[PDB]
Symmetry: D2
Subunit: 112 residues, 4 copies
C-alpha cells in the first residue's frame, strides 16, 4: 500500500509548473507511464501505489525543455529532459519526490 508522488515548482515564475510531461520507468526498462501535470503541478493519481510500487530503482523523465519552451528556454536548451534516478526500498512507504526547477538548475529531494 505504498505510494510515489511528485510535484514541480517553476522557480522562475514562482508558480507550479503545469502540463509538463513526466516519464516514469523501472531501472533498465523503458517508459511504462507518461503523465502530464495539472495546474497545481501534480498528477491526480500517484505515479505508483499499491501492488505497482515495488522495491527497486526507478527513473523519472521531467520534460523541462518543452515546458520552458512553451514560455520563452532556447533552440537547444541546456536542460532538455531532466532525469532522476532513485531507489524505493520499502514497498509500503510513501515517497514524495518534488522537483524544484529553473532553466539552469534544479533541486531534487524527498519531501513528504
Amino acid at each position: 500500500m505504498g505510494k510515489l508522488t511528485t510535484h514541480i515548482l517553476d522557480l522562475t515564475c514562482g508558480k507550479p509548473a503545469a502540463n509538463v510531461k513526466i516519464g516514469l520507468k523501472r531501472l533498465g526498462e523503458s517508459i511504462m507511464k507518461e503523465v502530464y501535470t495539472n495546474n497545481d503541478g501534480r498528477v491526480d493519481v500517484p505515479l505508483l501505489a499499491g501492488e505497482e510500487l515495488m522495491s527497486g530503482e526507478y527513473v523519472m523523465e521531467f520534460h523541462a525543455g518543452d515546458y520552458f519552451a512553451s514560455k520563452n528556454a532556447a533552440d537547444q536548451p541546456f536542460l532538455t529532459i531532466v532525469t532522476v534516478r532513485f531507489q524505493l526500498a520499502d514497498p509500503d512507504a510513501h515517497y514524495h519526490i518534488p522537483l524544484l526547477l529553473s532553466p539552469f538548475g534544479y533541486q531534487v529531494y524527498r519531501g513528504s
Copy 2:
C-alpha cells in the same frame, strides 16, 4: 576549445566529496569515461574539452550511493546513482556543472 567541468559538495559534512565515481556518456550511448574525484571534489582534467566536446546531450552518473556508504547511507539507499542529463549547445563554451549533494536531495546547476 570548449570545456566541461564538474564539482561535488557534501552538504552534510560541508566538505568536498572525494573519490566519488563519475560516469560520463553521450545520450543513447554507454559509459565513455569513468573518473574518480580528488580531495577538492573535482577531477584534474576536465571530463570534456577541445575536439572531444561536441554539441548534443550528455549524462553524468555520480555515484552518490557508494560515497555515502563509505561514510555511514543504508543497505538500499534512496539515492544510488544520481543521474544528470543536459545539453551542451556551443562546442566552444565552458560548462561548469556542480552537484550539491545530500543523502536525500541534490542541487544540479550551471555555475562557472
Copy 3:
C-alpha cells in the same frame, strides 16, 4: 483572507524536521510569533492569515542550529539560526515557503 505557511525537510534523514523553533517578525520589528513545528514538520495554524497578513517584508528565524544539535551539528555550528527575508505583496494570496535544510546548506523557495 491570505495565508502564509511554511514547511521544513531534513535532507539528511529524509524526514520532516520537527520541533524546530520558528521565529516570525515584520521587517524592522522583533519577534511577534514563535512556533515549534509538529511531526510533519509544519505548524497546525498558519504563521499568518486573514487580517494579520499584510503586504510588506517579513523574516523567519528557523532554528536549525538547535535542531541538528538534538540529533548530533557541532559546538559552534555553521548554521545557527537560518534567517529568511521575503516580501508578501498581495494581502489575499497564499504563500507556502518551505525550507529544505542540510547542516551546510538550505533551499528557500515558494512552493504552493
Copy 4:
C-alpha cells in the same frame, strides 16, 4: 589567516549575477562593508580575511531585488534582500559561501 568568499549564480540566465550589492555585517551590528560583484559574480578581494575574520556569527545581504529589477522581477518583489546568517567558528579556515539565486528561491551552501 582565514578567509570568507562568496559567489552568485543567476539560475535563470545560467550566468554569474554581476553588480549585485552585498552587505556584510556582524551579528547584532549594522553594515560594515558593502560590495558590488564583478562580472564573474564575485568580489576581487574577500569580504573577510586575516585579522578581520573572527569567530562569531555574520550576515550577508544579497540585493537580489534590485538585481532582477535591472533585468525585468516586479514592483514589489517576493525576494527583495536575500539575507544569510551563518557562524564562522575557526578564525583561520576558509569559507566559500555561494548563493544560487532564482526569482523565487535560492540555495545557500558552503562550497570550497
